[PDB]
Each structure stands twice: as C-alpha cells, then as structure tokens.
Amino acid sequence: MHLKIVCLSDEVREMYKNHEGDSGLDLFIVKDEVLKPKSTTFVKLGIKAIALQYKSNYYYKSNIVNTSFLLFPRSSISKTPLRLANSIGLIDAGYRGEIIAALDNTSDQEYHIKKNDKLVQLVSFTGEPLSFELVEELDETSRGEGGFG
Amino acid sequence: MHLKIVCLSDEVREMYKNHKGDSGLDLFIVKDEVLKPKSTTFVKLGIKAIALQYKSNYYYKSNIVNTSFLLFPRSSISKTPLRLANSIGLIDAGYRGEIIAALDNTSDQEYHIKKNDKLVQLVSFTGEPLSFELVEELDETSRGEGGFGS
Amino acid sequence: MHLKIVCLSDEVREMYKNHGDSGLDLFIVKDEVLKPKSTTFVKLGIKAIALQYKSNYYYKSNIVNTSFLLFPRSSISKTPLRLANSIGLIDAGYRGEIIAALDNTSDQEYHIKKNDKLVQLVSFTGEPLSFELVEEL
Ligand SMILES: Cn1ccnc1C(NC[C@H]1O[C@@H](n2ccc(=O)[nH]c2=O)C[C@@H]1O)c1ccccc1
Ligand SMILES: Cn1ccnc1[C@@H](NC[C@H]1O[C@@H](n2ccc(=O)[nH]c2=O)C[C@@H]1O)c1ccccc1
Ligand SMILES: Cn1ccnc1[C@H](NC[C@H]1O[C@@H](n2ccc(=O)[nH]c2=O)C[C@@H]1O)c1ccccc1
C-alpha cells in the first residue's frame, strides 16, 4: 500500500522527511502537549493522508485506487497509561481530514506527550508493506489542501 | 462485502429501512438502556447478520461465500466514557446469534444510551465497501431464524 | 493462512499438540498473579510465523511470511483484563516470543491460570487458520 501524506506545517514536514518494508507506518506526535488526568484528548497528528492499492474485486449489491486503512496503537503504548479510545481507527477511502489519535489518559496524573513521540501507526487492511511520499495536496479541493487560492 | 441482516423485532426493522462507498456500516442502539458505573454491559443490538464475499483461494495446510467479519467501535464512541471491552469483535462465518456489543462504562456515573445512538459498526476484513439488505432469515436453522414452524 | 509455531518449552508443546476457524486461540501457559490496576507483559511461550500466498501489492515462491494480528477473545470481556494495545500487530519479520500486554483494570489482583484462553491469532484477511509445531523458523 502506498500513502500520500500532506504535512500541515513545516515543522511536521521536517519530521517526515527523516523517517521500513514494514506493516505499520509510525506517526509522530507533532507538538509537546499535556494530557489532563482521566480524559480523552483528540491529538492532532498534523497530517492528511490517502492510501492507494491496486483495484480489487469485491462483492457489492485506474489500476490504482484509493483505499480505506487503519490507525493502530503501537505496541509500546502499552508501557504508558494512554490507550486508544476507539480501539482501532478506521480511515475511509475518501478521507481528507487531519488524522486524529483519540487517546485516553487512564492515570490521575497529567501526562506529557513530547514532539517525536510515536504512539500510533497506519496499517493496511491487508497487512502489506507500506510506502509513502510527501505531497502538497491530496486533490483539488480545499479540504484536499489543493486547488486555487 | 454484502451483509444479510435479520431484524429481531418490528421496531428494529424500521430503524434499518431508514438507513444513512463506505467501509463500516453503523449499527443502532435499539432500546433505551442505563449502563451501571464501572461495569461491563452486554448490549444486544437486536440483529443477526451474515457477510458475503467472493470466494478466495487461501493457503491452508456460487463464487459467493459466507465470511467472518469485524465489529468496530465508531470513532465517535471516544467522546463517551464507553469502551469496547474486547477491542474489536470478531464474528465468525458460522455465527447465527444476536450481535452483541460489550461496552465498559469507564465513568463512575451511570451512562444512559438511547434508541438510535450509534456506537459500533460492522467492517469487512478487507475494508472494501459494504452493502446490506434486510432478510427474514440467515439460513434454515432456528438459530438462523428460518425453516419450518414456530 | 498457516502458522508455524515453535513451542518454547517441553510443557507448552503439550498444550498445542492436543489443541477450521477465523482465529486460533492461544493458551495462558503458567499461573500468574496480575497486580491490581496494572499492565503486565504476559509471555505466551510460542514463536510463530504465518504463511499466505504471495500477492501483488502496490508499493513505491508460492508462499511468503505475512504479518498477522493478536486479538483478544470475546470472552476476555467477562474478566477485568483488557488488551493494552487493543490489537497486537505481529510483523512479517518478527522472530521473538509472542507477548500479550494485559491491563488489569480491577482494583484487586487477578489470577490467570494455565489453560486460560484470553487472546487469539487472526489473519489480515479473516481467512481460516491452520498450524503445525516446528523446531525453528
Ligand atoms: C475527533 N474529531 C473531531 C471532528 N471529527 C473527529 C473525528 N472524525 C472521524 C474521522 O476522522 C478520521 N479518523 C478516524 C479514526 C481515527 O482514529 N482517527 C481519524 O482521524 C476518519 C473518521 O472519518 C474523530 C477522529 C478520531 C477519533 C474520534 C473522532
Ligand atoms: C456476553 N455474552 C452473553 C451471551 N453472549 C455473549 C457474547 N457472545 C460471543 C459470540 O457473540 C458474537 N460476538 C463476538 C464479538 C463481539 O464483539 N460481538 C459478538 O456478537 C460472536 C461470538 O461468537 C459476547 C459478545 C460480545 C463480546 C463478548 C462476549
Ligand atoms: C514486552 N516487550 C519487551 C521487549 N519488547 C516487547 C514488545 N515488543 C514488540 C514486539 O513483540 C511482538 N508483539 C507486538 C504486539 C503484540 O500485541 N504482541 C506481540 O508479541 C511484535 C513486536 O515487534 C511488546 C510486546 C507486546 C506489547 C508491547 C510490547
């Protein structure tokens, strides 16, 4: 699966210019942030992303198409008090919004995520190796980050 | 992937006639229910379902088959204190029971769910788009809601 | 999909020798006390690879190793244990022991017993699973 990732700030772009014939693509925490104790915080991952797979035959009742994909916790999240609220995120084929990780802080202390933490990863519904590239837009629409003005 | 869904009551049938390219199919909470604080409740979704996909050759040591499939939380469950106790439910190809969501109320107060809330969704193992239709039975067994009599 | 499982001990091998569906259950292999309000890395005492047919995938001889998944069993929900990382992703390249990160959410300790089945191995496609017990991967 191949992902096109639009970084929403330059600080993020520099993180991903760094960065793997692997199943998951790790995502960065892009900004130091405090998570209140006993809370769910919607943590903005500062990127938009489209995933491409070869067209496939599926039952329902241009070799390369958009596809839905998954936001998984990284196994090393287990070591912390944070847990993904929604278990596993399902990003649909369309999707053009900022990817959000919803993290439950299960402790009663506040928790500091730091820039460059990796808590979550994108994963293909097929488990296949992921490749990505930075692009400036996903498509022509404003939500795509493309088009005029 | 195509879901044949059997609604277990008339009330549920109407909710599914009225239903709003997509990878998950939202399921309704079908009955106002109070969930106790700090507990796990097995919330009956009032439906049974099977999933149909193209037959595949798979390594294991008409072209439409029954397939196993996935029960995911909707991401809007995040706003609530309700968490899905088994993370992602696996429903096997053969399963003819009512679909249950096991919801942990992590809050220390009672949580009230309403008829028409949508907290969970069915999703295909391959993430392809889903269609569904409402049917009177899944198969000929009683558990499947079908066959002769009562 | 098909799994090659190396049992890490004499005693574990037994449990799998005396064990086609969508997930393969894994045993709790030794009695253990889980502390209250805690996360424990519970060792399952197996190594495993998974084999599926090669596929064309977009990216920029019959068989290959694929990634597979570690799901909780639906029955885990009767316990106060939760899988910390929701669903475990075991990569194609992984040769180490399989661990289940379990959160004990109880304010009391919780004892797991050998022959408990709390988690299960599932394939990316939901296809029926099979395994054999080898000596090495
Ligand atoms: C938080 N928030 C504020 C406005 N919209 C939202 C959300 N919308 C879900 C979309 O986000 C995408 N989405 C889905 C799952 C996920 O884990 N991360 C996502 O970005 C595809 C889903 O379609 C939202 C996002 C994450 C957790 C909860 C809720
Ligand atoms: C709690 N309870 C009381 C009577 N039945 C149940 C349970 N049903 C397990 C089966 O239901 C199906 N099942 C599996 C996972 C799931 O998330 N939802 C389900 O309906 C397939 C599984 O085969 C049960 C249900 C949900 C979670 C845990 C346990
Ligand atoms: C516990 N521990 C000590 C040294 N390394 C670890 C761990 N490392 C992750 C590897 O284990 C494999 N792994 C991944 C996810 C999972 O649920 N179970 C696993 O066994 C493949 C992953 O690559 C570890 C294991 C489990 C949860 C968190 C962390």
Residue in C99, C103, C118, C122 to alter for ligand 3 test, most ligand atoms within 8 A of Cβ = C99
Q: Which domain holds residue C66?
A: 1-134
The reply to whether A18 touches chain B by the CB within 8 Å rule is no
Give domain status of residue A142, yes or no. no
3-state secondary structure of A10: helix
According to DSSP, the residues that pair with C63 across neighbouring strands are C53
Minimal C-alpha gap between B150 and chain C (Å): 31
Give CA–CA dist A143/B131, Å, rounded. 27
Q: How was this structure determined?
A: X-ray
Burial code of A14-52, b = ≥16 C-beta within 10 A, e = fewer? ebbeeeeeebbbebbbbeebebeebebbebebbbbbbbb
CATH no. for residue A55? 2.70.40.10
A48 within a domain of the structure (yes/no): yes
In a domain, A84, yes or no: yes
Resolution of this entry in Å? 2.6
- C88 contacts chain A (CB < 8 A): yes
The angle formed by the CA atoms of residues A132, A78 and B89, to the nearest 5 degrees, is 80
Q: Are A50 and A138 in contact (CB under 8 A)?
A: yes
Residue A140 lies inside a defined structural domain of this protein: no
Neighbours of chain A (3+ CB pairs under 8 A): B, C
Going by C-alpha positions, the residue among B138, B132, B147 that lies closest to residue B48 is B138
B114-142: burial string, b at 16+ Cβ within 10 Å, e else: eeebebbbbbbbbbbbbebeebebbeeee
Is B147 part of any domain? Answer: no
Side-by-side strand order, sheet with A89-91: A24-27, A120-124, A69-73, A89-91
- The total of structural domains in chain B comes to 1
Q: How far is the CA of C119 from the centre of ligand 3 (A)?
A: 14
